[PDB]
Structure 1
Amino acid sequence: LTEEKQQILHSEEFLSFFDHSTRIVERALSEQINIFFDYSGRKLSLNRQFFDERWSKHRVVSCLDWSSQYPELLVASYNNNEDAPHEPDGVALVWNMKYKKTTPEYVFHCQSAVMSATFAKFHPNLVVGGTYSGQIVLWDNRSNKRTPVQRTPLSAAAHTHPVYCVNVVGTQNAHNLISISTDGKICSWSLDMLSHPQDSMELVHKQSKAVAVTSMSFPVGDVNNFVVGSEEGSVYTACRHGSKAGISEMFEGHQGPITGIHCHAAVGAVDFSHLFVTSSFDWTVKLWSTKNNKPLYSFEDNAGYVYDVMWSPTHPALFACVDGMGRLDLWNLNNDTEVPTASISVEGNPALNRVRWTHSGREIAVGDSEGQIVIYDVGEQIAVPRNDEWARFGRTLAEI
């Protein structure tokens, strides 16, 4: 560490050395020409999924739902067991990640066959569920009863056909528990009157054809514009309020039963965005619209028996179309067309009943053809704001 070149002012040895080094680096290829280089110069973020056949034994995971009224805790009902000699059939179980468990948290067995089930408005323990028997069972673990604490009278008060879709549409001040069966019936009840129907009526067509609902969905944001899928397609788009009962209008684009649909809005309902996509057995996945009965092209998820479509309304430019053998396919309209954005085929080959997107976020519950709780996530894809690319994509779709 001598002179740290302190001799860089007026010396001559280091100066001549630096000049010679510069000349050598500038002429380090003295072969008079170019050197002969011999022409060579020389997305899953799986959470604590659950599987325990104490009740998952041959019981298909029915309707999946994160806790929306509470902080993001999924609950999914079940189906009938093929190994129950005397056991109750509707055994809805809960799977709340807040408990940090491995097995299902709460067991809810009922003799009937539960089809649809949901939570309670400002009641952390009232489990409600429309069954196959035409009634709506009601569990409540706050009173320590695995069995439904209250069963709806199966007759004319309730549905005379299997209840397939039930949830409230009203707020805490105007709750309307609406149940929908294959009878074409809709039945709204209060929080406690399971004898007096709040708003019970039907939705039947002109002729004698038995209107068979197929994965019908409530209006997005309770705008009364609900959709009813049927077996020959037959999207029954109708309203609720006023005298708009019965069958308002319909549209078909296929002949398969729409077993998966999702009425949606924008990234904060900037537009109407009621171009709900489907999941039918012809594998059609179309961005259907109520007003414009037959809108833009169907993004049919081929090479798979498509089952359901659902997505978080927080940035709906992230949505999955799964199939009969488990093909998680989520994408964005502004960037993807039929290829996914960040998803993959589901583990093994399961028959995905429900896809359940996280409340204003991302983690997705996966319900299959048995009690098989698979809780994925993507993580990398974030609900990016300024989603005007999706908006202008809709604008371009509105051209041709």
Structure 2
Amino acid sequence: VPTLQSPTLMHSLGTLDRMVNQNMYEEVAMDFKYWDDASDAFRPGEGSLLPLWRFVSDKSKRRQVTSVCWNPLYDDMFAVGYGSYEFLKQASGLINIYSLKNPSHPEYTFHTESGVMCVHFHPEFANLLAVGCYDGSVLVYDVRLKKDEPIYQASVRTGKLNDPVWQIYWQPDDAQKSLQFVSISSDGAVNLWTLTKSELIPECLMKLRVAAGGCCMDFCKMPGQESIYLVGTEEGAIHRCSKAYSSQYLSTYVSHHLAVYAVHWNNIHPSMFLSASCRLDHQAVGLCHDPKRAVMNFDLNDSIGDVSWAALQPTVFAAVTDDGRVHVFDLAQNKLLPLCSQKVVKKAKLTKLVFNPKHPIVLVGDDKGCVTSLKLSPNLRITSKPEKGQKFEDLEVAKLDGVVEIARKSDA
């Protein structure tokens, strides 16, 4: 009943602040949606990311972007998981949540007390955000409550991975009495978590045996089925199993010598994943059979932060290395050379690349606690348009398969 503390005052003030901040970046946003690079219908063989919004907060500069994730419904949310990767500069972690509606001030925020080495939003409900931490504590945060604190934790009583939790995921549990989580850790291996009464309980999935359980630092699951996923290691190899111990390492795609840093499936042609390591080469390899060779190889000058197939097309993909250059390949215009290699940051080593499902932009993330958002010039995004007698998934299977057979019989 004092008007100057009424909640609806704060509501309309927040909307008026967005209404202000829009009118401070009008060009950056109008280009985000209504602009096509007019000088790439003239030179067919290359492209040019155009840099857009930049997102910094003053608690971030002492921190390093250590994950990024996008929300299923709205397509203006991020989830930056600021944290640490150096062995000697170990800090407390952070997690903002940003928006495209205001880029300057984050909508939400939290403040953990170890390095947030992953995030993931839930796909169906659209708010609950699972995270992990440098010290095994997987956490779950609920967002619309506006209480700067978790709603569940882990302990050493329920379950604790005991070393960094590099990646976590959300499983769809269909209208059941639960929600599901799959994880991965340096010591020991994959664990399943549930969301019970007021707790999160481990169930162990498999152990990554080779000295000790071999370390591992990433995994991805195939969308189109669920059980079969791809797991990195630090012994070097890449493994693939299913949600069982059903032939521990169903596939053992072994080709590497160091810590692999990224794997990725590609949403079209469900047999073909690429991967990427810290041996300065990323390899785009086929999986139904084919476990002893790589269809291709793309060497480069500094080790890979990460890789990502495009959401909109299974030829183009992009990769991010430890120099300042994001470089992005079309696998069907050039053949072993990057279509567009551009340096975006000045004095930081980039470390995280994430695409966007609907609008065509990309997020890349620094070493200095910042995230910067690039746009893809039209030569990078070329989806073969469907027609009357054919389906869109089929043409994009066909392009990749043609490139695969060409370089398969041309390699040897």
* TM-score normalised per structure 1: 0.77
Q: Which moved further from structure 2: 308-317 or 381-390?
A: 381-390
Match among 291, 294, 301 for residue 293 of structure 1: 291
Matches within 5 A, 1:365-384: 365-381=363-379, 382-384=381-383
Match among 146, 166, 173 for residue 144 of structure 1: 146
User: Secondary structure of the equivalent of 1:395?
Assistant: helix
Counterpart of 2:329 in structure 1 is 331
Q: For each residue in 1:196-254, what CA deviation from the matched residue of structure 2 results, as whole angstroms up to 9, or x when unmatched?
A: 5374333232x6432201222233444422122122321121111x4427444423222
* 8 A contact 1:110–1:148 mirrored in 2: no
How many positions carry a matched residue from both structures?
Answer: 345
* 8 A contact 2:278–2:304 mirrored in 1: yes
Identify if the C-alpha distance between structure 1 residues 144 and 72 changes in structure 2 by more than 3 Å, giving closer, same or farther: closer
1:158 CA drift (Å): 3.5
Q: For each residue in 1:33-60, what CA deviation from the matched residue of structure 2 results, as whole angstroms up to 9, or x when unmatched?
A: xxxxxxxxxx1232222122x2212211
Identify if the C-alpha distance between structure 1 residues 80 and 389 changes in structure 2 by more than 3 Å, giving closer, same or farther: closer
Matches within 5 A, 1:188-227: 188-193=192-197, 195=199, 197=201, 199-205=203-209, 208-227=211-230
Q: Which moved further from structure 2: 337-346 or 189-198?
A: 189-198
Write the distance in 2 (CA, Å) between the matches of 1:179 and 1:218.
11
Identify if the C-alpha distance between structure 1 residues 59 and 192 changes in structure 2 by more than 3 Å, giving closer, same or farther: farther
* 8 A contact 2:139–2:150 mirrored in 1: yes
Counterpart of 2:17 in structure 1 is none
Code of the aligned partner of 1:46: P
* 8 A contact 2:305–2:351 mirrored in 1: yes
Please tell me whether residue 51 in structure 1 is matched to residue 49 in structure 2: no
1:323 CA drift (Å): 1.0
* 8 A contact 1:88–1:109 mirrored in 2: no
Counterpart of 1:27 in structure 2 is none
Match among 226, 235, 238 for residue 238 of structure 2: 235
1:304 CA drift (Å): 2.2
Matches within 5 A, 1:79-228: 79-80=83-84, 89-97=92-100, 99-155=101-157, 157-170=159-172, 172-173=174-175, 175-193=179-197, 195=199, 197=201, 199-205=203-209, 208-228=211-231
Counterpart of 2:14 in structure 1 is none
Write the distance in 2 (CA, Å) between the matches of 1:193 and 1:246.
33
* TM-score normalised per structure 2: 0.75
Structure whose residues are more often helix by fraction:
2
Write the distance in 2 (CA, Å) between the matches of 1:221 and 1:58.
40
**RMSD over aligned Cα, in angstroms?**
2.8
Please tell me whether residue 78 in structure 1 is matched to residue 90 in structure 2: no
Match among 306, 310, 313 for residue 312 of structure 1: 310
Code of the aligned partner of 2:227: N
Which structure would you say has the larger Rg?
1
Write the distance in 2 (CA, Å) between the matches of 1:88 and 1:320.
30
Could you tell me which runs of 5 or more consecutive residues in structure 1 were left unpaired when the two chains were aligned: 1-42
Identify if the C-alpha distance between structure 1 residues 141 and 220 changes in structure 2 by more than 3 Å, giving closer, same or farther: closer
Write the distance in 2 (CA, Å) between the matches of 1:245 and 1:154.
31
Could you tell me which runs of 5 or more consecutive residues in structure 2 were left unpaired when the two chains were aligned: 1-47, 385-394
Q: Which moved further from structure 2: 57-66 or 344-353?
A: 344-353
Write the distance in 2 (CA, Å) between the matches of 1:360 and 1:72.
10
Match among 390, 393, 397 for residue 400 of structure 2: 390
Write the distance in 2 (CA, Å) between the matches of 1:359 and 1:376.
14
* 8 A contact 1:153–1:195 mirrored in 2: no
1:118 CA drift (Å): 0.9
Q: Which moved further from structure 2: 354-363 or 384-393?
A: 384-393
